[PDB]
Amino acid sequence: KGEELFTGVVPILVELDGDVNGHKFSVSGEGEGDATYGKLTLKFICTTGKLPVPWPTLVTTLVQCFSRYPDHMKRHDFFKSAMPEGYVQERTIFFKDDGNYKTRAEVKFEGDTLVNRIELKGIDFKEDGNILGHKLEYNYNDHQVYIMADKQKNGIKANFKIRHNIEDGGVQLADHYQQNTPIGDGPVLLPDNHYLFTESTLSKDPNEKRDHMVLLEDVTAAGI
Secondary structure, eight states: OOOOGGEEEEEEEEEEEEEEEEEEEEEEEEEEETTTTTEEEEEEETTTTTTTSSSGGGGGTOOOOGOOOOGGGGGOHHHHHHHTTTTEEEEEEEEEESSSEEEEEEEEEEEEEEEEEEEEEEEEETTTTTTTTOOOOOOOOOOOOOEEEEEGGEEEEEEEEEEEETTSSSEEEEEEEEEEEESSSSSSOOOOSSSEEEEEEEHHHHHHOOOOEEEEEEEEEEEO
16 A cells, blocks of 8 residues: 555655756755645745746646545555655646646655655747746646546556636646656556546745745545
């Protein structure tokens, strides 16, 4: 059981090294997760100065193993079943009429802490577009993730569309393609099709002088 490792509160560390149009940056994050209640509380900082993209565009990249799977759904929790060795999480995120992100992450236990270590590569962005121009509202519209098994990679796949509010009206689409594959060689729970539903709240810490984002999330799976 990898589920056992998530019975209480788990400390979380998130580390991202990024390059978007050659603009290098790093994000460091910390918080905790409670999969019994499906809750995450995290704070991220840009360790290199001003984040050169908007914070909301990184929410998806910055630990679906903390989803609350209800009792009748435990057998479909691929994420936890891969712990502690972890899983690799890869995405291409296409920003409509703009560039795309390519992310590759290891999600795994380092001793006591659940870690999410990410490499991100962004290309083909417009310098004065919504992303590199910072024209997105500091808020979030979540969207359901339809999890499918990817039996050839012994993991899962998903394709979901995120809508980012544009300053002064407008919606910027972020088309997410995702595949996960286990880091370990142990057996894994390959799920029937289901959804992950999450709700994200972005806020700020008044005392924090670095470019940062405070993130709270509720997350739950749901069958059929």
